[PDB]
Amino acid sequence: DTLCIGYHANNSTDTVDTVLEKNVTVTHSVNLLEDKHNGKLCKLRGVAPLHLGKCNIAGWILGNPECESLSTASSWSYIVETPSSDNGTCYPGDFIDYEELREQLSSVSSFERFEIFPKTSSWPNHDSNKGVTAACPHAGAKSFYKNLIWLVKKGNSYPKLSKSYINDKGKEVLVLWGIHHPSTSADQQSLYQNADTYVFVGSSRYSKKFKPEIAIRPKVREQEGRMNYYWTLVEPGDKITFEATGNLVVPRYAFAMERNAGSGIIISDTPVHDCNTTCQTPKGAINTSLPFQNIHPITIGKCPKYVKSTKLRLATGLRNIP
Amino acid sequence: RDTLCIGYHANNSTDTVDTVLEKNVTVTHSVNLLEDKHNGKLCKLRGVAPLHLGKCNIAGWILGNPECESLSTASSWSYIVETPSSDNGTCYPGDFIDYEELREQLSSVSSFERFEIFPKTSSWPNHDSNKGVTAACPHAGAKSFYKNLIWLVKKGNSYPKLSKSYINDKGKEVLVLWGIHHPSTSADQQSLYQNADTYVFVGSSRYSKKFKPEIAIRPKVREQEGRMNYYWTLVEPGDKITFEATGNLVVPRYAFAMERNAGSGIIISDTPVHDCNTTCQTPKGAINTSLPFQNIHPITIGKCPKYVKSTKLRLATGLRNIP
Amino acid sequence: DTLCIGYHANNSTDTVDTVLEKNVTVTHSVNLLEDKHNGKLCKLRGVAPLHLGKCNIAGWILGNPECESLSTASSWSYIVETPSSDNGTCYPGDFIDYEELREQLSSVSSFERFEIFPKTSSWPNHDSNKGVTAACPHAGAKSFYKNLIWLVKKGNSYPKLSKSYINDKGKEVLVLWGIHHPSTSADQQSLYQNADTYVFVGSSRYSKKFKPEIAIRPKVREQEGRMNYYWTLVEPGDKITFEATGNLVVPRYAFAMERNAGSGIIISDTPVHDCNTTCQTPKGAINTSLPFQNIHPITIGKCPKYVKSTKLRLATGLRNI
Amino acid sequence: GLFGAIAGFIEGGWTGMVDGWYGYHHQNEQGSGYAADLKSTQNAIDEITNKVNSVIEKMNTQFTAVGKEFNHLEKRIENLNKKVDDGFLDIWTYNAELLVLLENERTLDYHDSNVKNLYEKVRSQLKNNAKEIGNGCFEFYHKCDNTCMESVKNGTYDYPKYSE
Amino acid sequence: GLFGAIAGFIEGGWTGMVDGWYGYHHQNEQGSGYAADLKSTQNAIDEITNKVNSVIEKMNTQFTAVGKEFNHLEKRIENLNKKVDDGFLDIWTYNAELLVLLENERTLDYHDSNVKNLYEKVRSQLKNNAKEIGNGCFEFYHKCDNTCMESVKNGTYDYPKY
Amino acid sequence: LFGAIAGFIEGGWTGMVDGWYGYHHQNEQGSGYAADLKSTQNAIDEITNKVNSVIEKMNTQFTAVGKEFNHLEKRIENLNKKVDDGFLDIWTYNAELLVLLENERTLDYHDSNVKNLYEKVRSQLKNNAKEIGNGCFEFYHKCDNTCMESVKNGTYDYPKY
Ligand SMILES: *[C@@H]1O[C@H](CO)[C@@H](O[C@@H]2O[C@H](CO)[C@@H](O)[C@H](O)[C@H]2NC(C)=O)[C@H](O)[C@H]1NC(C)=O
Ligand SMILES: *[C@@H]1O[C@H](CO)[C@@H](O[C@@H]2O[C@H](CO)[C@@H](O)[C@H](O)[C@H]2NC(C)=O)[C@H](O)[C@H]1NC(C)=O
Ligand SMILES: *[C@@H]1O[C@H](CO)[C@@H](O)[C@H](O)[C@H]1NC(C)=O
Ligand SMILES: *[C@@H]1O[C@H](CO)[C@@H](O)[C@H](O)[C@H]1NC(C)=O
Ligand SMILES: *[C@@H]1O[C@H](CO)[C@@H](O)[C@H](O)[C@H]1NC(C)=O
């Protein structure tokens, strides 16, 4: 009559490593490493991302004729560009503080686009129709950004213009405008009669005078001239003033905007879907409670720490014998 | 019948601690590794006390805003304290260039003496150094201006090209500040400095920049449709700085012989400043501790404990407690 | 007849610390802390570093007359300056985005220097010989940067110049140029007749117009005038255009260049040698498998984590009796 | 292992015992069979579960968007960003890797301890009434029926029964 | 717990023994009483103290001023700074939290070990001269006076006994 | 922790130089030390693995720490300094504590191995020898050399006396 004392065993093949021994077979185990994503770009808090698809931020805000898709959503958790989305600033130029702008726009609480300077009523002494170019084609036809207007002289006359907007929204207004630098002093007077011109923009915090730099730059999209793009946020109750004797690409549409920090921008081909996620990567979303993931270093949301590990198998049972 | 037992201590202790295997385990003795206690005061850091601007901010303090008149009696400070509601700085609307950089450079100073780089009486003989006041910088109802700068205006329909140079004869760096004035209208321009097309030039061995007044109507700020941008530079010992203008130059009056020691910052807080020592300072108050971790505040100045999100880090020293 | 069970012991004096006890003598132990360097600047990947010795990056790329001996090299893993190498921009001025340039140049894959605008054939209407100064002396004689040419007027005439280069290499081309700011309006017309001048540089991505700022700056190396240095990378197939009515210090030599990120610059007196290393510090290279080193915080390569520890002795044996 | 029980003086485990981690195998006149130690097994499950949960639950992260954009003239701050990212990568990888190695070592020893303790419990219960085979097995000197095996598992084993 | 002594075969602790962590409770004709094991208790105190001191003393920090200022057009580097701050916060919080959990587990087992060892020491000292009750208690077969209990604590116990 | 090393076995044997744990026999054929081949090799393997794990798990990136900033970038310079000192404090602390922790465990690991080697033989010769109490066994039955073998090999398979 005997009584023995022993321990469990099974068909398990799970191995784990210890400080003293490698490849130790155990009866039970859990994985602390999340290595599984749903290969989709999903919605963040509860809101979906802004997908530009074909265009990039530059093209989207300026209103490139190709980014004419939709009356865009009023809010987004983050932004998605594709690695091959090229249509942005069609007219060659320099977008000032572009990266900063992209960051500021990465995630928005409310976002409504309005006509800051109505085309019909705003510019009575200047031509607001001739301002199109072959550098911004929309179906064969020469066209231009939708949110800006390329003001040219009205029959051999370009009077000093002076327009002001006063932020009567309840939120910040994002105002964009351009400065045009002709290639030749002939093109200069052809467009804005006056030879020596200037543009001035000013608010309570912003103030800068612009002098057109006239010269022949190497051809880009057929243009030897250039066009630099500027932007600023007008505080509620504040007012912004435009003043130019030429070369000013005036604002038409601006953006009443309320932003919430803490997001970014994903460049990926990964399809956007209607699903929830607490953590997003360029390769797809991550649904997990685990502390570590080896899916991607660049992450958006409340995510697991990125690790180089391939397997983090944690032993819960005991050594396995037959 | 005779006997002898072997056992362990126990007491009235209620201290609980967590282990990897078990939570809320009552123990006989324990210590707390987490410092969660501050003295709610802004104290001295190394030996030295902090520079308190109180009502004003760095901008106002260095430019010499008429309101920040009560303060610069310290020749050194461990760090700087602004209040969340201290609004007096650049009273005349404008742009302070590399302001954040300046604030950093000034955060902690070893020696700091303010001197009159360009004496008001003897320096500008061909320009008016008295009319340069504005309603944007009021000191007791009266129109006034920054104390450390002088707004040079024309002397009766005449503004001759000026050219003044200072040569750093101190033993340390000199912080030189100056302004460029951008009138709102070309009329205001000639009203102040007769000449219509003007320029200002500042240059040393390392610094060099020419300034062109941008004349235009900016939206009214503190009654001003014009603007005034503020610039600064550190002149190395033995080096010299040259000012040259045909107008629009707000010249330096006072500069700062200065020796700086890196490694400090700036606290924006209402927390009262006191006469006490501390090795670690937070916006909420100082921290006296040997513990490795604190959950009082993330932003810290000095040799401090690592900030942690933990609420309690109770470390067991005794053993399980039984009755 | 007895049988006992015991454990090893020896003459070892090695001590180690535990959570419960300090200075515990142990039979055997290993050190996890690497505290040993070879006091030499060695090759990093397989490639040696670019040593400027006497000169700094500024002087080296501009072609300071003193940095005449140096870059027999078409590639380097990292760059070495000496703490006392002073020879750079001899003519007082401002090197724009200098730090950025130094970073971009820190490590290059291929690097060949060519004559972008040949001195003899490029400038027919301007003087390309008088452009020397006492601020850039080479053996008593007044001289100037080798990679730039200080174009001055050709006998009371400085015609608007316009030269373009088109990147026909297979790689990026680093183009450098300078803008000269005379001290006096007299010096201005003395050098470039015209009083009101301008220079313009432009490619597909770069575009900037330069206006000479004429004034008397405090004397530096005898110069009350200044000279600012600019640079840009011209993409393959792209072209860059120079245009000036004066004050333009034109490019002579440029650099066909292919760069590989991930390196830096060491300022040290430590001698450079012919040896391999996987980890480099300003004090010397580090050959080790250990996880931690206390030799230097600033490191280049695949290195051990820098620690403040003095000793990290790990016990392998047992207590010693 | 560390306690000499598991893979020690108890060489192997029982695939037969499927209802628990630690248990007994009785052998008397009423037959044979395995049976896990209810209380002993549940305790380990609770504590091991808590362990796993502690390693996971203590990792409370912020809502952050890693990844920044820099232009061709910001390579330095781009590399600074790259440094902080790779800095965290090395830190977390090492800690996570070592945390697993450490906790696994302890867990296996934790089970070794539980088996050793279960043996000690029984052995110090039937002093003379049974002799140690040495294989974690006890051979009864006094006949032991099923309701007797119960008084051993429940730890409620009467003594007064010494025979021969 | 891990060694089966504390809260194991020795179910509870003695509030009566206030002079040490581990000790004895004798019971003979000269009376009763508790008494901590001087040497055994002091050793734990030394080692446990060292432990606490190691966890603290190894944290040697730099003199740094966390906190930077950025203007409205430096939001990116501001967020970079924020990232490095929250990065350290998560790292330290997790490690500190886990360090406590781990070290507490070990410490409790450390005491369990010390009690188990103190029992083993005595038991292997008086083999036959006393029988194990099973409650960490030994019942003497040979009368044991006070100066006898001493030879057990001092570990200097003889065996002439029946 | 296990009461063996520096416990009921007060000291170690400088005489035993061929292993970490071993025996010292004493019979009519003489005396001598002899390490436990299998027991010693096992510790060496595991301890080696330990040291190797602490080292091998540290897989680093190819990075060039150190950045250059001009006089007007002091802020980002200090940001860089912060991230450098941040890593310094983190690694120093962890490395320091890792050593303290692993050393504690290693010493206990050896204590365990000695205690286990004793338990192994004790539970092998029950009556045939009595415990001196110093990790020593005194044989009741004469034990020759080929007998000492059946104790080391753990093949003391015939309790005759
Ligand atoms: C929008 O993006 C495309 C792609 O980059 C631009 O480039 C060319 O557009 C023409 C006209 O349809 C196509 O024939 C080419 O295939 C496009 N290029 C390439 C390389 O794909 C296009 O010009 C852009 N249109 C606008 C108005 O911006
Ligand atoms: C310093 O701060 C005060 C307070 O903001 C400024 O005073 C304001 O001026 C307006 C204009 O009439 C008053 O109506 C407000 O009531 C004032 N605020 C307060 C709290 O009184 C003052 O102008 C500043 N002085 C300088 C030179 O900075
Ligand atoms: C087992 O361990 C060794 C040592 O780490 C390793 O080389 C191998 O990958 C493992 N074997 C298998 C079959 O996975
Ligand atoms: C526990 O209980 C009493 C009542 O509060 C108290 O006086 C005493 O200090 C406590 N015992 C100890 C040792 O702290
Ligand atoms: C014991 O520690 C002290 C203090 O750290 C140290 O200076 C001394 O060298 C140590 N003793 C020995 C012999 O290593």
Here the contacts of A9-16 (C-beta below 8 Å, separation 24 or greater) are A9/A320, A9/A321, A9/A322, A9/D12, A9/D13, A9/D14, A9/D15, A9/D17, A10/A320, A10/D15, A10/D18, A11/D15, A12/A317, A12/A320, A14/A313, A14/A320, A15/A313, A16/A313, A16/A314, A16/A315, A16/D100, A16/D104
**Contact assignment for B323 to E63 by CB distance below 8 Å:** no
Q: Among the atoms of ligand 2, which is closest to the Cα of residue B60?
A: 28
Region F1-161: CATH code: 3.90.20.10
For residue E112, give how far its alpha carbon lies from the nearest alpha carbon of chain A (Å). Answer: 22
Contact criterion met (CB below 8 Å) for A148 and A251: yes
CA distance A256 to A236: 10
For the CA atoms of B202, B207, B212, B215, the dihedral, rounded to the nearest 10 degrees, stands at -90
d(CA F82, CA E95): 20
Round to whole Å and give the CA distance between A162 and A175.
16
Q: Is B130 exposed, middle or buried (0-12, 13-18, 19+ CB in 10 A)?
A: exposed
Residues of C forming the annotated binding site for Mg(2+)? 8, 28, 273
Resolution value (Å, 1 decimal): 3.0
- Scored b (16 or more CB within 10 A) or e, A182-214 reads bbeeeebbebbbbeebbbbbbbbbbbebbbbbb
How far apart, in whole angstroms, are the C-alpha atoms of residue B316 and residue B319? 7
Residue contact A213–C200, C-beta within 8 A: yes
The 10 Å Cβ neighbour count of residue B156 is 7
> Which residue, judged by its Cα, is nearest atom 3 of ligand 4?
B12
Is the sign of the CA dihedral D29, D30, D33, D34 positive or negative?
A: negative
Cross-strand pairs, C255: C113, C174
The neighbouring-strand residues paired with A207 are: A202
Give the technique used to solve this structure.
Answer: X-ray
Among B214, B216, B219, beta carbon nearest to A203: B219
Nearest CA to ligand 5 atom 7: C23
Q: Is A253 exposed, middle or buried (0-12, 13-18, 19+ CB in 10 A)?
A: buried
A156 and A41 Cβ atoms separated by less than 8 Å: no
Binding site as annotated, residues of A for Mg(2+) = 8, 28, 273
Q: Kindly report each contact of residues C185-194 with a partner whose C-beta sits within 8 Å and lies 24 or more positions away, as own/partner.
A: C185/C214, C187/C214, C187/C225, C188/C212, C188/C214, C188/C246, C191/C152, C191/C153, C191/C246, C191/C247, C192/C152, C192/C153, C192/C158, C192/C245, C192/C246, C192/C247, C193/C153, C193/C156, C193/C157, C193/C158, C193/C246, C194/C158, C194/C245, C194/C246
What residue's CA is closest to ligand 5, atom 13? Answer: C23
Nearest CA to D67 out of A178, B199, A103 is that of A103
The rounded distance, in Å, linking the Cα atoms of D68 and D65 is 8
Closest C-chain CA to E55: C19
Rounded Cα gap, residues B161 and D150, in angstroms: 112
Where in chain A do CATH 3.90.209.20 domains reside?
42-273
How would CATH label the architecture of A1-41+274-322?
Ribbon (2.10)
Cα separation values, A196 from A190, A208, B51, C195, E124, Å: 13, 17, 50, 18, 108
| Domain span(s) for CATH 2.10.77.10 in chain C | 1-41+274-321
Written as one letter, the residue type at C117 is: F
Residues of chain B with CATH 3.90.209.20: 43-274
**Do the Cβ atoms of B17 and B31 come closer than 8 Å?**
no
φ/ψ of residue C230, rounded to 5: -125, 160
The enclosing H or E element of A226 equals strand A226-234
- φ/ψ of B193, rounded to 5, equals -135, 115
SS3 F94: helix
Tell me which amino acid residue D55 is: V
Whole-angstrom distance, CA of residue A296 vs CA of residue C141: 60
Mutate to test the pocket of ligand 2, among B87, B146, B228 (most ligand atoms within 8 A of CB): B87
- Calpha distance A3→D149 (Å, rounded): 8
Q: What share of chain A is helix, strand, coil (3-state, %, to 5)?
A: 10, 40, 55
Q: Which residues of B touch F71 (CB under 8 A)?
A: 234
- Rounded to whole angstroms, the Cα distance separating E79 from D66 reads 9
Tell me, using a 6 A CB cutoff, whether residue A86 lines ligand 1: yes
Contacts with F, C 271-290, CB within 8 Å: 289-290
Cα–Cα dist C216/C239, whole Å: 36
Question: Residue E65: beta bridge partners?
Answer: B301
Instruction: Test C218 with B201 for CB contact under 8 angstroms.
Output: no
Residue A293 CB less than 6 A away from ligand 1: no
CB B85: neighbour CB atoms within 10 A?
A: 9
Q: For residue F29, what is the DSSP state?
A: T
Pairing of strands C305-306, C292-293: parallel
- Spell out which residues of chain D touch residue E86, defining contact as CB-CB under 8 Å: 62, 64
Q: Is the CB of C241 under 6 A from ligand 5?
A: no
Q: Please give the DSSP secondary-structure letter assigned to residue C55.
A: B
Among the listed residues D34, D32, D7, D4, the one whose alpha carbon sits nearest the alpha carbon of residue D22: D34
Q: What are phi and psi of C115, to 5 degrees?
A: -85, 90
**Where does F2-73 have alpha helices with state H?**
37-56
Calpha distance D98→D75 (Å, rounded): 34
The residues spanned by each domain of chain F are: 1-161
Residue of C103, C291, C305 lying closest to D75 (CB–CB): C103
Chain A residue with minimum CA distance to E79: A262
The CATH number of the structural domain formed by C1-41+274-321 is 2.10.77.10
Contact at 8 Å (CB) between A8 and D17? yes
Residue closest via CA to ligand 3's atom 9 equals A23
In three-state secondary structure terms, F75 is: helix
Query: Of D26, B178, B96, which Cα lies nearest the Cα of E72?
Result: B96
Task: Look at the domain B43-274 and name its fold.
Answer: Hemagglutinin (Ha1 Chain); Chain: A; domain 1 (3.90.209)
Q: Which two tokens stand for residue A73?
A: 């959503």
The radius of gyration of chain E from alpha carbons, rounded to an integer in Å, stands at 26
Beta bridge partner(s), residue A20: none
The DSSP 8-state label assigned to residue B318 in this structure reads: S
Q: Where are the beta strands (DSSP E) in C60-197?
A: 79-81, 108-114, 133-138, 141-143, 148-150, 161-166, 172-181
Closest CA to A262 of D65, B267, B162: D65
> In F125-144, which positions are buried (b, 16+ CB within 10 angstroms) versus exposed (e)?
beebbeeeeebbbebeeebe
Q: What are phi and psi of D163, to 5 degrees?
A: -110, -80
Integer Cα distance of C293 and C309 in angstroms: 9
Where are the CATH 2.10.77.10 domain residues in chain B?
A: 1-42+275-323
**The CATH fold of domain E1-162:** Hemagglutinin Ectodomain; Chain B (3.90.20)
Which CATH fold topology does B1-42+275-323 show? Hemagglutinin; Chain A, domain 2 (2.10.77)
Q: Whose CA is nearest to atom 12 of ligand 5?
A: C23
Nearest CA to ligand 5 atom 5: C23
Which secondary structure element, helix H or strand E, spans residue E130, and what is its range?
strand E130-132
Residue-by-residue DSSP string for A94-156: -BTTHHHHHHHHSSEEEEEEE-SS-HHHH-SSSBSSS--EEEEEETTEEE--SSEEE-B-SSS
Cβ–Cβ gap B98/F72 under 8 Å: yes
How large is the angle between the packed helices E38-57 and F74-122, nearest 10 degrees? 150
Is F102 in the A-facing interface, judged by CB distances under 8 Å? yes
Residue bearing the CA closest to ligand 5, atom 6: C23
Contact assessment for residue C225 and residue C150, using Cβ atoms and an 8 Å cutoff: no
Ligand nearest to the CA of B92: 2
Helix axis angle, D38-57 to D75-123, nearest 10°: 170
Strands C133-138 and C141-143: antiparallel
Which ligand is located closest to the Cα atom of residue A22?
3
β-bridge partners, C157: none
The CA distance from E89 to C275, in Å, is: 41
User: Cβ contacts (< 8 Å) between E95 and chain F: which residues?
Assistant: 94
Contacts of E60 (CB under 8 A, 6+ apart): C308, F89, F92, F93
A22 CB within 6 A, ligand 3: yes
**Residue B174 in contact with residue B233, Cβ under 8 Å?**
no
Terminal CA-CA length for chain F? 36
CA distance B200 to B192: 15
- The listed CATH number (3.40.190.290, 3.90.20.10, 3.40.50.300, 3.40.50.1580) that belongs to domain D1-164: 3.90.20.10
Calculate the alpha carbon distances from C160 to A214, C197, C247, C269 in Å: 14, 9, 11, 48
Q: Which chains touch F (3 or more CB pairs under 8 A)?
A: A, B, C, D, E
What is the rounded distance in angstroms from the CA atom of residue F20 to the CA atom of residue B90? 77
Q: Which two tokens stand for residue B308?
A: 């942690």
Helices (H), C106-204: 119-122, 185-191
* Joined tokens for residue B41: 């005061």
Q: Which of D98, D123, D131, D132 to mutate to test the interface with F (most CBs of F within 10 A)?
A: D98
**B85 by DSSP, 3-state: which?**
coil
Answer yes or no: is the C-beta of A213 below 6 A from any ligand 1 atom: no
Q: How many B/D residue pairs have CB atoms within 8 Å?
A: 15
- Measured between CA atoms, the residue of chain E closest to residue A106 is E76
CB distance A58 to ligand 1 below 6 Å: no
**By CB neighbour count within 10 A (0-12 exposed, 13-18 middle, 19+ buried), where does E154 fall?**
exposed
| Alpha helices in F29-158, H assignment, sequence order | 37-56, 74-122, 145-152
Cβ–Cβ contact B262 with D under 8 A:
no
Residue of D nearest to B23 (CA): D50
Its sign, for the CA torsion C128, C130, C135, C137, is positive
**Contact (Cβ atoms closer than 8 angstroms) between residue A115 and residue A106:** no
Nearest to A99 by CA among A265, A296, A220: A265
- Tell me the DSSP string of A268-316: --PPEEEEE-SEEETTEE-----SEE-S-SS-EEE-PEE---S--EEE-
Cβ-Cβ contacts under 8 Å, C308 against chain B: none
Question: By C-alpha distance, which of E103, A295, A291 is closest to D59?
Answer: A291
| Positions of CATH 2.10.77.10 in chain A | 1-41+274-322
Contact C44, C77 (CB under 8 A): yes
**B122-to-B116, B118, B119, B164 alpha-carbon distances in Å:** 11, 8, 6, 11
User: Which among A40, B262, B80, E101 has a CA at the least distance from the CA of D51?
Assistant: E101
Terminal Cα-to-Cα distance of chain B (whole angstroms):
25
The C-alpha of F12 sits at a distance from chain D's nearest C-alpha, in angstroms, of 21
D74, amino acid identity: E
Q: Is B9 in the pocket of ligand 4 (CB under 6 A)?
A: no
Asked if D65 and A264 count as a contact pair (C-beta separation under 8 A), the reply is yes
CATH of C42-273, one of 3.90.209.20, 2.60.40.10, 2.40.50.140, 3.90.660.10: 3.90.209.20
Mapping DSSP onto H, E and C, the string for E60-84 reads CCCCEECCCCCCCCCHHHHHHHHHH
- Does residue C140 come out as left (phi exceeding 0), alpha (psi in the -120 to 50 range) or beta? left
Helices (H), chain E: 38-57, 75-123, 146-153
Whole-angstrom distance, CA of residue C242 vs CA of residue C116: 12
| F57: nearest CB among D3, D94, D105 | D94
For residue C92 the two structure tokens come to 């007082």
The percent helix, strand, coil of chain F (3-state, each to 5) is 50, 15, 35
D138: contact with A, CB 8 A cutoff: yes
Name the residue among C45, C106, C51 with its Cα closest to residue C273: C51
Closest Cβ–Cβ partner in A6, A298, A305 for D67: A298
Distance from the alpha carbon of residue A136 to the mean position of ligand 1, in angstroms: 10
Q: Kindly state the tokens that stand for F8.
A: 């009921």
Cα separation, B111 vs A242, in Å, equals 47
Question: Is residue A104 within 8 Å of residue A125, measured between CB atoms?
Answer: no
The C-alpha R_g of chain C, in whole angstroms, comes to 28
Please give the angle made by the CA atoms of A6, A8 and A13, to the nearest 5 degrees.
140
Nearest CA in chain F to B262: F78
